[PDB]
Design a protein around this nucleic acid. Structure first.
Lengths: 50, 48, 101, 49
RNA sequence: UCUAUAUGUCAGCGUGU
DNA sequence: CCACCACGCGGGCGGTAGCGTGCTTTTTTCGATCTTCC
DNA sequence: GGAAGATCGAAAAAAGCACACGCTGACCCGCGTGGTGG
């Protein structure tokens, strides 16, 4: 049902949607969205689990 | 009126600035700069 | 393609913001007016940037993101109306370049 | 304690009490949604007179 | 009552409830 | 003629991004549908 | 057969969260920019 609900169908569209949700009012750029997604949870300095 | 927003001395030569005084100062500064910009024949985007 | 954007700059760090922006290789613009006055007993024609705390930049958002410019040292914040940042048409820049008050 | 002052604004500014306190007085009077009201007030979209 | 001694929130609390 | 002392207005801070994150009740609006018609 | 109103769940915004008293600390612009008078 969740797969049916969402309109995104590719990795680039998902990254663009994630960037728009994270930072509203900014131009959606593929490299910027990729960097934001990488730094959200897969960056040592930005994200750290004790 | 100033008495409703006074500047009480702090026994050390300083004055405790009230929040209303700061807001009025900010508004006056913005009005003055907007007047200067309008008198400068500035374009539409900047004055907007 | 490269577009024109307007930025509020913090009072006093307009110069260092300009150097930082030139370090990132983007086009910058700010009106310039020279006025003659007495300083320390001598008359000098000192330059003063018209419309203080305002910068215009020609830059391409794809090659360099807007948030990177927003985080540049010495720059206060992008001038924006609504969610999206404001866009300065080329005619405004044309007038500003030929603006000689 | 009684004498007040006045500041002559170079441009008109809408009172925030009559604009944001639901229901919006300006929006109700003009019969327009609040969204376009805040858009035009805060310089986002033109409006025809 | 101008005769003295003529700041406020915040944070931490505690007391009576 | 140059190093310590005012100083005077924007102000989100600081940075070449992101910061947050344990309530309930009421009111307003919005998207998605629906459903009923002329 | 398309439109209008309509409605219904869901999302977003605003306001409130008892009283009284006693005590402690921390100020109540920082910083690039003159500017000065040694």
């Amino acid at each position: 049902e969740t797969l049916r609900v969402d309109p995104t169908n590719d990795r680039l569209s998902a990254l663009v949607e994630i960037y728009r949700m994270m930072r509203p009012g900014e131009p959606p750029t593929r490299e910027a969205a990729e960097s934001l997604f990488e730094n959200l949870f897969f960056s040592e300095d930005r994200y750290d689990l004790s | 009126p100033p008495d409703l927003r006074p500047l009480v001395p702090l026994d050390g030569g300083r004055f405790a600035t009230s929040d209303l005084n700061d807001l009025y100062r900010r508004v006056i500064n913005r009005n003055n700069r907007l007047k200067r910009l309008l008198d400068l024949a500035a374009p539409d985007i900047i004055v907007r | 393609m490269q577009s024109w954007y307007l930025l509020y700059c913090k009072r006093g760090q307009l110069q260092r913001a300009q150097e930082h922006l030139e370090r990132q290789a983007v086009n910058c613009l700010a009106p310039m007016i020279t006025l003659e006055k007495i300083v320390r007993g001598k008359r000098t024609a000192v330059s003063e940037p018209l419309f203080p705390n305002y910068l215009f930049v020609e830059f391409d958002p794809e090659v360099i993101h807007t948030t990177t410019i927003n985080a540049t040292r010495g720059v206060s914040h992008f001038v924006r109306f609504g969610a999206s940042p404001a866009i300065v048409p080329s005619a405004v820049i044309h007038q500003l370049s030929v603006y000689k008050p | 304690r009684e004498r007040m002052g006045h500041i002559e604004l170079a441009s008109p500014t809408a009172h925030i009490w009559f604009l944001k306190s639901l229901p919006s007085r300006i929006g109700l009077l003009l019969d327009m949604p609040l969204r376009d009201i805040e858009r035009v007030l805060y310089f986002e979209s033109y409006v025809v007179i």
